[model samples]
Target: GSSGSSGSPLGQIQLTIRHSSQRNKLIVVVHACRNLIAFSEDGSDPYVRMYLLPDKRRSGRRKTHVSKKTLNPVFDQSFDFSVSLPEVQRRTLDVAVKNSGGFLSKDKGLLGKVLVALASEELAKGWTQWYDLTEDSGPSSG
Candidate 1:
């Protein structure tokens, strides 16, 4: 048998996840991406895109603007989804880092991605963590 290969580390993304029971919403904060690989000669123009599992509708999508000319970009943007705490707990957060740059760009697709589990006891208080990016597997199926 051949040796197994490990997934290359794309980078680290900092995000804040929280649920607001009163508003019945799930909030996400896109803080920053660190140590990202350059996708072009000038560098990659990065942005964050997200969707809650089971619902990949266009209306359910959230994204941030592109940050230009840097390997490490600070987004510091926030977005919210109108979903109950319990319902959100049953969902998975899909976060993907992408490069939105000019034409003739080879690295215009997904840079990396992370699947986040939302089933936590402390939904109201929330927590911030840095997640490592994995290969883009797109959507999952049974």
Candidate 2:
């Protein structure tokens, strides 16, 4: 994703995830967007990756298999995916997204933009909450 004009500079890509319950199924929607200008011909396509994390207390530190990968999604366009949880007790769920890259980017501006969008939507639905980073950290680190 890019923000400025094509000739000016390439901006960062934005990603968002929303969780909703429908008919006993958990629906997750992912969105990717970017702001950029084109000089007759300038564009960039972005990809998004999603991960579903289970309750840390119940599952310990094991990784869940619920995940999805999407490629070359258009700007401002949203992609939706869903996963159902087993009949059990759990405390929390974790959803994460990035711009196709497996590593975190150095540009906080881009990350902040995406988070703003995510929080805005989540807050509107009264589903936003503070995330506990300590829970994700292993016991040794804690």
Candidate 3:
């Protein structure tokens, strides 16, 4: 999901999923102009940072950091990042993004969050609830 206006030049962030050799990979795509056009008079750089949460429900565990890249006005860009899971376990992918203003505005920084749930073939076919991360009681999935 996008955290800000599309026409604002702040860029829009999206998450997509692709299946690869029985495993699922998540891709993050961004679209925007090089500078702020209308929404905010203050010019801001259009960039996005991604993160992954191992489970659906919130916990004390920190999110896994991916890479940060800037959006180019000359091109429509998409980034692919993958995770591999045992055939028996169910998992989820979480995505987050920080706008240019958000990134430079704070010392520690704040980023938006997006979450997606995925299941293994066995779990997809109605396997035991124990295999489900949403139902299981554990420290963390990753």
Candidate 4:
């Protein structure tokens, strides 16, 4: 809600939603990215970090495998959120596409992000979409 998603810093993330009422969790795939910028001069070491909001107990946080030096990186990885269909819908997704740095370098730089509000949307039957990344807001979710 702070910066605009029109400028996707980390580019765009491909997301596919799979929902089932008989299930206890949701699985999300990190397909790939385009137009990513490097963190260091040598180039960038990019990776994805994510979290399903309101599940705070230090849980629901997930990340994609790191991609080597390149502007556009392809990470076909996935993460599971242990939330039910009914409850998961009320939460927001906090995603960050970050540039890898030192062991304590997380606060330094970011490629882009996507802040999603799940108030009203098709969460059933599943669907895939490319979300535009944005900057840090009050919280990635409400």
Candidate 5:
């Protein structure tokens, strides 16, 4: 048997479509995340972080509001990034469940992150699906 190195599902994420008239922009509804791991005693002061990869710049970074003191957090939020549909198709969707500490705190990083391949049949059309969280993404994933 071929035993691999690292393997696991951090959690799961729900992605839904917001709306559109053209493909000039991509709008995704980040509904929520579940089965999240904890970093704090009362669980983590969690938030959902997203990046439209390659453009890992500050202006390019996107994040949801913090959901306090729980492993499972809800963020009924949507983000619309400006990019051509085809261009976005080539880019990566990097999402992670992150624990955020206060100004005096140094606790932060991935609770569960996923590198999603946007080159799906549902890419342009957009479909609702539950994608599993992973340790990281491969070259193609991003």
Candidate 6:
């Protein structure tokens, strides 16, 4: 049997979310991804984009490096969003994995996404987990 078919649900993105009381900032740590759908026959260049919901301004956009030609990529990048604990608890973290097309290529597109709610009290303690990507509307949507 050749050309084994894969399952659905795009992929899973691993990350860590935490709130810093002293810095009054939200910390997002992008770790890696697995089994992402390839945009090409070989693989696609994947990068991560983040936003602290309801604030999709340019200043609020955080990005990661584009790891080339791999269904599974590793980032281990860190980001900080200056927001108070109380204020952040009312916000959501938007993580989107996207493909970075090559020069002259117009294939750049969203691979998958996950929206994380920050109302949990355990956010201060922080935990690392694999978040499955979906195409549904998140909390930020009306």
Ranking by TM-score: 1, 6, 5, 4, 3, 2
lDDT of each structure?
A: 0.81, 0.30, 0.37, 0.70, 0.72, 0.79
Q: Relative to the unseen true structure, what is the C-alpha lDDT of residue 16 in candidate 4, on a scale of 0 to 100?
A: 75
TM-score of each: 0.84, 0.29, 0.39, 0.78, 0.80, 0.83
Alpha carbon lDDT of residue 129, candidate 2? 33
Pitting candidate 4 against candidate 6, the one with the higher TM-score is 6
Candidate that beats the other on TM-score, 2 or 6, i.e. the better one: 6
Candidate 1 per-residue lDDT over residues 1-142, each given as its tens digit? 7866454457779889989889888889998898677666677887788988868889856888778888788879889889987777778888888788756855467777888888887878989888988886556621
Candidate 4 at 56: error in angstroms? 4.0
Misplaced by over 4 Å in model 4 are: 1-10, 103-106, 137-141
Best of the candidates, lDDT: 1
Ranking by lDDT: 1, 6, 5, 4, 3, 2
Candidate 5 local Cα displacement, residue 87, angstroms:
0.7
Clashing pairs in 6: none
**TM-score-superior candidate, 2 or 4:** 4
Off by over 4 Å in 1: 1-8, 105-107, 137-142
- What lDDT does model 3 reach? 0.37
Per-residue lDDT tens digits for candidate 4, residues 38-104, read: 7666877787777777664565457777777687778787777677766778887777787876555
Listing every candidate in turn, what is its Cα RMSD in Å to the true structure after a full C-alpha superposition?
A: 2.8, 11.4, 10.9, 3.5, 3.2, 4.7
lDDT of 5 at 100: 84
Residues 1-142 of candidate 5: C-alpha lDDT, one tens digit per residue: 6878444446788987433437567788889888777755765777888888767888877899888777778878889987775667778777777778654565566677777666454556678877777775445444
Compared with the true structure, model 5 gives a TM-score of: 0.80
Q: Which stretches of candidate 6 lie over 4 Å from their true place?
A: 1-8, 102-107, 136-142
Candidate 1 TM-score over all chains jointly = 0.84
Evaluate model 4: give its lDDT.
Answer: 0.70
